[PDB]
Design a protein around this ligand. Structure first.
Ligand code: 09C
Ligand code: 09C
Lengths: 583, 583, 583
C-alpha cells in the first residue's frame, strides 16, 4: 500500500551517510545524480555512500544519472552584465563577440539555419524574449526585435521554441558522463533535451558496446519532443517529464495538458514515467508544502505517474527528510482516494489487446474481483513486473527476481515491491517459491489470495504467459462437504445437545459427533456445521442441505482435533475447513 | 466554447467603471462583493457601477455577496503584541482579559463546552497551535500546551478542528448584510462557515419573508461541513469551496482529495460549484501565473467545477485584467483537452436515473453522437439549464429565459450562455423562438443541428420533459429521393453530356434534365445526382440506385434554379437538398 | 400486451361473415388473400366481407394480396402419370413434348441458359431430383441423371437451386392481380419468388402510375434472394419469409439459420417481417398444435418477427378459430418470457446510430428505465410508429394517425396498436390529443407515465424528432414541498394529536394543520406528511426534513379537502400530491 515511487536528487544537504539513511527510511526508491554540476569525484563518493547505506538497511534503492545534455548559451558579456530596451533591436551573431545592447553572440553557431523571420528566441530561461526581424547569412547575423526588456549575464542559456533544434543527441561531456555510469553499473540514465529517437539511440549504441544493461529515460523538454513522444518511447526504456524545463519553451497554461498526455502515452506502452521538477520547491526553505504543491503532486499521481521526483528539496534544501516524508504522504493520500475499478477499466481500453498483454488483463481483473492480497510477479528482466504494473491493480505487486540489477530497475515501476530470491529452474519451484516469498514479505498470511504470474518456461521467456490463483494454505480440517457455500464463524464444539442449550446466539459453527433428533432444533439457528463421521444422506448431512447451512461431514476426530471458540472458515464445495478468514 | 465560469472579487483595484468594463471583457460572469470588509456605502456604489457597465455592454453579469460569517477571535493583547514559548502552557479564559504569555481570552465564551482534553486550538489562522491539557469549569479556563511557538496580535482569529463548533448560522451583521442583498436584488449569497443545514435555513427563512429568490451557496470550511455535504446540498442552491479557509482546520495534504469529493457531490445533484481562494494569488504582484497555479486551476476544472473565483487577484491586486484574461485562457486550454465521451459516461453512472433526469440523459447522448452545435434550454427558473449542464455535453448550452434574474442565476452554471427572450405561451412558439434565438446568438447557422429542450406545458413546468432535434433549415431544393444515403459536394449543372466531358474529377453532384445512355458513363464517376423531372424507375433513378449514388429525381427546374459550383448536401431519404453542409 | 401480429389466409373455411368475426376476435390483424388460386370474383367478395365485419366490430384489419409469381412447370405427361428410374437418364427439352421416362418438357423455355453441367433440377417441389449430365443447344436439350426415383404428374413445378433463375419479376397475371389490388385500396402486396431489387421495382412502378400507396413485401424463396437481402430491403416496405417455399430450393437443415438472419436484417432497417408457412399445419386436421409447432412459432418470435402467418390452418382447415386463438396464445407466452433489457441493448448495437434514429433510441431507454405504460406515436405515414417498434420496448406503442390507410399499414408492425384520430395542426394540439388518446384506449390511467413522440412540425415531417415524457395528470393537492423524495401510502387526516394515538402502524401519510411538540413523536413513525399552512422552517417542515420524511407544507385546506384513508402519492420536489400511484 505505497504504489507511487519516489526519486530524490542527492546533493550537499543529503550526501551524508546519516541523511541518506533518513531519506531511504522516508521512502526513497531511487537516488538521482545530476551531472549538470559536480565532478565524477563527488558523484563516485555519493554512489558508494548510497550503495553501502542501502545494503546495510537491506533495501533496494536504484541509481539514476541525469546527463547535462546539449544546450545553447551566451558568450560572455561586456562588464559582465548588459541591458536591453523593450522596443529596440539586438543582433544575434554566430561569431563570438563581447556583449552589447546591440551585438551579442551564442555558443551554438548553427542557430541561424534553424530559425526564420518571425521566430522567437528566449534568453536566460525566458527572462527576456527576442523575435527574428531579418536574417543575413552574409554577415551571419540575426537582427531581432527585443520584446520584453531586461538584463543579461555572461554564460546564460538560450531557447528556441521548436524549431527543430539541430544540436546533437549528446555532448562529448555526456558521452564521458555515461561511460562513468557504465563503470559503476548505474541503473538509469536520464537523457536531457531528447527530441528524436536518434538522440536516445546515441546513448544505446554506447551502452551496447559495453553490453551495459541500463534503462534510458528521455527528458522531453520541447515541442519536437512532445510531437515525437510515440516514436521516442518506441526506443526508450522509460520517460521523465521535467515541467520546469518544459515550461520555458512552451506556455505554462498548456503544460499540464501535455503532462497528462505524455504520462498517458507511457502507461499505454507500460513504460514507467517520472514526473519531475517544481514539485515541492517551497520545501527547500519551509518545513511543510503549500496546498497548490500538495495539489499538483497528487494530480501527477491521478494523471498516472509511476513515480515522483525531488530536485532541490532533497539536494541542497534545508529540509530534506521532511520533503521525502511529505512526498510519501501525499502519495498515499491521493492513492487511498482513487477508484481502481475505473482505473483498470480505463487501462483495459487504453492499452492494446494482444498476446503479450493477455495475462496482464486477466491478472488485473482476477485481482480486483477476488480481492487478492498480492500479485507475485516472477521476472528475469522485469517485463512481467511492468506488464502487471501497467494495468494498475489494487493488489501489491511483488517482483521476485534472481537478478539484483533488474530488482533495482523495478524499484521505479508503479506498485512493484521487488525482492531478490535465487533462480529456480522448474515451473513447480517457481510457484512454490513465489508463495513462500509472498509470505516472507509479511504482507500476506494464511487467509489471503495470491496471483502468481511469470513467463514460463523461464528459459524461452519472452513475455509473461501464465497465472495461478492460490490460497495461502492450509486446510486445518477436511472431509465430505455438503452444500456448496461457505461462511466465517467462531466454533462451538458440542459433546451433548445440552452442551449448547441455554448459551446460543447464531454466528457460530457447531462441531459434534453426529446429529440426533435433539440436535436438529439447534443446528438451524447456527452458521455452519462440522460432524465427525457420517455419509452424504446422514442425519447430519440431510439437515444441513435442507436448512441451507454449509456443512462438512466425515471429519476425522472433529470434536477432539478442532479447537473450541477459535474463528474458522468452512467451504462446502471442496469440503475443507480453515484456520481463520479464507476465500 | 467557454464552459467554465469566472467569479471576480471586486475591490479598490477594480471599482472603476473602466476596469469593470475590462474585466467583463476579460470574461467575468459574476461579480463578488466581500462583506468581511467595507461598508454598505462602498458596496452599494460598486453594485451600481456593475449594473450600469453590464447593461451598457449588454452582457449578463451576476452579483454575489459573501457574508463574513461567525468567527472566534482573540480579545486585545497587552502591549498589542505578546509571545508564546514552544514547550510552555497558556490559559484560554472565557472571560475577557488582557493578553499575556499565561492568560489570554477569546470572544466565543462558549468554546469551553465544545473542546475536550487533547483537542487542538489554532491561533491566527494556524500561526501557532495549542493543545488542551485540562479543563476547569470552576474558573472557566482551558489550560493548554503551546506546541509551536510564535507571536500573537490583538483581534486575531481562532480555529477548532471539528469539533462541532456551536456558533450560530449567521452574525447579526450577516443578517443585516443579507437584508441589504434583498434590497438590491442581488443574485447569490455565499454563506460563510456553513456546517449544518440549519445554517443555510437561517438565511432561507430571512429570504422567504421577503420572497426574495436568491441562490444560497454554502462555504464548507471545516470537518463538520465536509461530513454534512450531502445534507447541506439538500437545502442549498449551490456551493463554494474555499481552500484557504479549509486548509486551516484540515491538513493541506488532505485538501485536494476533499475538493474533488465535494465538487463530485455537487455535480451528482446538479448544484453549481465554485472553486475559490488561492487560485492565482501570484498574479496580485506579477503579470503572469506560475505553472503550479496554472496546474491547480485546470485540476479544478478536471475535478468538475462549474466555476472559478478570484479573490485578491482582481480585488486589490496590481494586475486585475491580466488575471481574468489568464483565468479564461487556462479554462479554455484544459477544457479543450478533455474527453466529453468519458465525461458524459461518467455523469451517466454518477447522477441518478430518474423521471426528473430522463431528458438530461437523452439530450446529452443525442448531443454527443449527432454532434449538435447547440442545446437551447428554455427555462423560467433555470432548472432545465442545470439539468442539461450537469451532464456536461460538448454542445454549447443556451438558456432562453423570460426572467432577467433567472438569467443572472444561470451565468454561473457550467457551460450555459443565457439570453433573455420574452415569454411565449404555446409549445409551438417556444420551439420556433428557440431556433431563432440560437441563430441570433450567431453560434449556429444553417448547416447545424440543434436540440431544443424545455419543460412543457410552460405552466405546469416542474422539470424538463421534452426535447426536439432540429436542423437549422432549410432545403433549397427537393423532390423524390432515390437511395437512402447522403453526401456533401460541389455542383456541376450539366446541359449536355459534353458539358462535363474533359473536365471531371469525382467529388461533385451533377444536375441535368434526365439521364441518357450518354450520361450513364459520367454519373458513376460522381458523388451525387439531381435530375430535373423523372419517376422512381426512371433512367436517372435506376442508374443512381444501382451504382450506389445518392440521388433525387423530380426536382422542379433543377438546372435553372440550383446554382453551379456552389457546395451542396443532398439527402436520399427525405429527398431534400441543402445550401452547404447539413446532417 | 400483445405485440406480435397475426396474418390469416382467408379461404373456404373462413369466408363467412360469422367466421371472419370469430377470427378478428381471436386476434387477426391482417387478412391474406392468395392469388395463386381463385378468381377476382371470389376475392372481391371476401374483401367486402372483411371490410364490413371490420368496421362493424370497429377494429383495424389490413388486407394483404399474395401474388402467384413467376414459376417453372412441366408440360403435360403421357397418360397423365409417368415414372422415372433411380439410376437412369431423362431429357429435359425446351420444346413442348408429351411426357416419357425419356423425353420431357418445361414451360420455361430458357432454362437451358441458366443451368450447367452438374447443376441440380428439382421436380414437383423436390419429389424427385435430377442432375445435368450434358447440354446440347443443338437440339436444345438437357440430358440429366435421375438421382431419386418417383412418379410425375402433368402440370407440376420445377426448381433450380440458385442458379440466377432468369424469370421476370412478375407474371402478366400478377400485373393484372396487382391492378385489382390498386382498385380495392388493398394495404399490402406480397410479391412471390423475389430475388433482385428489379423484381420489387416492377411492382412499384405499377403502383406509382396509380400513386397507389401500398406496402410491398418480398417473399425470398431462393439463394439469389437470400444473397440480395440487403439490396431488396433497400427498395422494399417489408418482407415475408415463407419457409415451405424456401425449404425446396435450400436444405431444411440450413433453413432456420437463414430465417434468423433475414428477420435480423429486417429489424436492422425497421422493415416489418412476416414469418410464414408450415406454422401450425397440424391444426388443419387437429384442434390443438404439437409441441414442435408451438416451439417453432415461439422461436420465430424470439428471432424477432413483427408478425406470424397462417396458411391452410385458417383458409381451408377444419379448425380456423382455434388456430388463431392458439397462435395468439403462443405469442403472448413466449413474449411474456423475454428480457426487454437484453432485447433493447441488442437493437441499440444492431441498428445504426443516426439522426433518423436518435429518438427511437432515447424513447426505448427512457421507456425501459422509467417503466412507462404507453408510447403514443403520432404518424402521418407510420415511419414514427416503425422507428419506435424496431427498438422493441416493453411499453405498448400507440399509433395515432389521421390517415385511415396508414393505420392499416401499422396493424402489421411489431407492438403497435393503431388508432385514427383527426389531424391537429399545432404541436400543442398534437401533444394534448396524444394524452387523451392514450387514456381513451383505456390502457393508461392517472398514475401512468407516457412518452409522446412524433415528427414536428407535422408539415416538414420527414423523420421522428421529438419526445415528451408525461404523467397522466393530475395533482389533487399541492404546495411547498420539503425534502426531495416521494412515497405511496394511505392517508390519515388528524384533527388532534389523539386523533392518531392508539391506532398507528407506519405506512401512512398524515394530514394535520400544523405540528406541535405533541405531533412530533407520531410524525417520525409515519411515511409522509401534509400540513395545511406553513413556511419552510416551520415546525412541520423542519421535523420532516430532519427525520427524512418527504412532506409538503402550505396545502390549502388540506384537512378538509384531501380525504381520509384513500391511498395517495406525494412528491417532495415539485411539491405535488396525487390521487393513487404516481412516479
Ligand atoms: O472484466 C473483464 N473484461 C474483459 C476481459 C478479459 C479478460 N482477459 C482478457 C484477455 C484478453 Br486477451 C481480452 C479481454 C480479456 N475479461 C473480463 C474478466 C477477465 N478476467 C476476469 C476475472 C474475473 Br474473477 C471476472 C471477470 C473477468
Ligand atoms: O442507457 C443508455 N444507453 C445508450 C444511450 C443513448 C441514449 N440516447 C442516445 C442517443 C443516441 Br443518437 C445514441 C445513443 C444513446 N443512452 C443511455 C440512456 C439514454 N436515455 C436514457 C434514459 C434513461 Br431514463 C436512462 C438511461 C438512458
Amino acid at each position: 500500500m505505497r504504489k507511487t515511487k519516489i526519486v530524490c536528487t542527492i546533493g550537499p544537504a543529503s550526501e551524508s551517510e546519516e541523511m541518506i539513511e533518513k531519506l531511504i527510511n522516508a521512502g526513497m526508491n531511487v537516488a538521482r545524480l545530476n551531472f549538470s554540476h559536480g565532478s565524477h569525484e563527488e558523484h563516485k563518493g555519493r554512489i558508494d555512500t548510497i550503495r553501502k547505506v542501502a545494503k546495510r538497511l537491506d533495501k533496494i534503492v536504484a541509481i539514476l544519472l541525469d546527463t547535462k545534455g546539449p544546450e545553447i548559451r551566451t558568450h560572455n558579456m561586456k562588464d559582465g552584465i548588459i541591458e536591453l530596451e523593450r522596443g529596440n533591436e539586438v543582433i544575434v551573431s554566430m561569431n563570438e563577440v563581447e556583449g552589447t545592447p546591440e551585438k551579442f553572440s551564442v555558443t551554438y553557431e548553427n542557430l541561424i539555419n534553424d530559425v526564420q523571420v518571425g521566430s522567437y528566441i528566449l534568453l536566460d530561461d525566458g527572462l527576456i524574449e527576442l523575435q527574428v526581424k531579418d536574417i543575413d547569412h552574409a554577415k551571419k547575423e540575426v537582427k531581432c526585435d527585443i520584446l520584453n526588456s531586461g538584463e543579461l549575464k555572461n554564460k546564460k542559456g538560450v531557447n528556441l521554441p521548436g524549431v527543430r533544434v539541430s544540436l546533437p543527441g549528446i555532448t562529448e561531456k555526456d558521452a564521458e558522463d555515461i561511460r562513468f555510469g557504465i563503470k559503476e553499473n548505474v541503473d538509469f540514465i536520464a537523457a536531457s533535451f531528447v527530441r528524436r529517437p536518434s538522440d536516445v539511440l546515441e546513448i544505446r549504441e554506447i551502452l551496447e558496446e559495453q553490453k551495459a544493461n541500463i534503462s534510458v529515460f528521455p527528458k522531453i523538454e520541447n515541442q519536437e519532443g512532445i510531437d515525437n513522444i510515440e516514436e521516442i518511447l518506441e526506443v526508450s526504456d522509460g520517460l521523465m517529464v521535467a515541467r520546469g524545463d518544459m515550461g520555458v519553451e512552451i506556455p505554462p497554461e498548456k503544460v499540464p495538458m501535455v503532462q497528462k498526455d505524455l504520462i498517458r502515452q507511457c502507461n499505454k506502452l507500460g513504460k514507467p514515467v517520472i514526473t519531475a521538477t517544481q514539485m515541492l520547491d517551497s520545501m527547500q526553505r519551509n518545513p511543510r508544502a503549500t496546498r497548490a504543491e500538495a495539489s499538483d503532486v497528487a494530480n501527477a499521481i491521478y494523471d498516472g505517474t509511476d513515480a515522483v521526483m525531488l530536485s532541490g528539496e532533497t539536494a541542497a534544501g534545508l529540509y530534506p527528510e521532511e520533503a521525502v516524508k511529505t512526498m510519501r504522504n501525499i502519495a498515499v493520500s491521493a492513492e487511498a482516494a482513487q477508484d481502481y475499478k475505473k482505473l483498470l477499466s480505463d487501462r483495459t481500453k487504453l492499452v492494446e489487446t494482444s498476446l503479450v498483454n493477455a495475462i496482464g488483463i486477466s491478472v488485473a481483473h482476477t485481482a480486483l474481483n477476488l480481492n487478492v492480497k498480492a500479485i507475485v510477479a516472477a521476472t528475469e528482466s522485469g517485463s512481467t513486473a511492468r506488464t502487471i504494473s501497467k494495468y494498475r491493480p489494487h493488489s501489491d505487486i511483488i517482483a521476485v527476481t534472481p537478478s539484483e540489477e533488474t530488482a533495482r530497475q523495478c524499484s521505479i515501476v508503479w506498485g512493484v515491491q521487488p525482492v531478490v530470491k535465487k533462480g529456480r529452474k522448474s515451473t513447480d519451484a517457481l510457484l512454490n517459491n513465489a508463495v513462500a516469498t509472498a509470505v516472507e514479505t509479511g504482507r500476506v498470511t494464511n487467509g489471503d489470495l495470491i496471483i502468481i504470474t511469470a513467463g514460463v518456461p523461464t528459459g524461452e521467456t519472452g513475455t509473461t504467459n501464465m497465472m495461478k490463483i492460490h490460497l495461502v494454505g492450509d486446510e486445518i480440517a477436511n472431509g465430505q462437504g455438503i452444500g456448496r457455500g461457505s461462511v466465517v464463524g467462531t466454533t462451538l464444539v458440542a459433546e451433548t445437545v445440552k452442551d449448547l442449550e441455554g448459551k446460543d446466539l447464531s454466528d457460530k459453527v457447531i462441531v459434534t459427533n453426529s446429529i440426533d433428533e435433539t440436535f436438529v432444533p439447534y443446528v438451524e439457528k447456527a452458521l455452519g456445521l462440522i460432524t465427525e463421521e457420517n455419509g452424504i444422506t446422514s442425519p447430519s448431512a440431510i439437515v444441513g442441505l435442507e436448512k441451507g447451512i454449509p456443512t462438512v461431514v466425515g471429519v476425522e476426530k472433529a470434536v477432539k482435533n478442532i479447537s473450541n471458540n477459535v474463528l474458522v472458515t468452512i467451504d462446502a464445495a471442496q469440503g475443507k475447513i480453515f484456520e481463520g478468514y479464507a476465500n
